[PDB]
Design a protein around this nucleic acid. Structure first.
Ligand SMILES: [Mg+2]
Ligand SMILES: [Mg+2]
Length: 132
RNA sequence: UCGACA
DNA sequence: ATGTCG
């Protein structure tokens, strides 16, 4: 069953690698709670990773125990491992996204959370509410 | 085989 | 339809 009292996050991109953005919404209503400014170059998985970590910080800051839904098996694992195993080359054009990823990893290594990170079951429930 | 992003 | 991220 769907846990309606939750935060759903999803990445959006134009090309992959390409322009990456992401947002978090109230799973029940669809209200947009946060939306990251487009990042010139990044991968889908880096964006999915950044979205979940942003969500963890967002909920922690607001003293919320709501779970987070993501449809990304890859990103869910990276967060659990506290390491984003991306293949994106490291250059001046990808410096911005790599800095954000490194900082998200560092946040995971300096904070604790009880937030359940759940797999959104697209095959059974349709597209995630944070879909672009 | 599967989860995603285009 | 054809690609890339995992
Ligand atoms: Mg997604
Ligand atoms: Mg989507």
């Amino acid at each position: 069953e769907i846990i309606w009292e939750s935060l759903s996050v999803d990445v959006g991109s134009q090309g992959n690698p390409g322009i990456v953005e992401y947002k978090g919404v109230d799973t029940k209503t669809g209200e947009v709670l946060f939306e990251r400014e487009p990042i010139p170059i990044g991968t889908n998985n880096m964006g999915e990773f950044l979205a979940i970590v942003h969500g963890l910080r967002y909920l922690k800051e607001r003293n919320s125990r709501k779970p987070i839904y993501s449809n990304s098996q890859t990103a869910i694992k990276w967060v659990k491992d506290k390491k984003a195993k991306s293949t994106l080359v490291r250059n001046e054009e990808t410096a911005l996204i790599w800095k954000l990823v490194d900082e998200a990893e560092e946040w995971l290594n300096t904070h604790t959370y009880e937030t359940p990170i759940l797999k959104w079951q697209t095959d059974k429930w349709g597209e995630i509410k944070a879909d672009y």
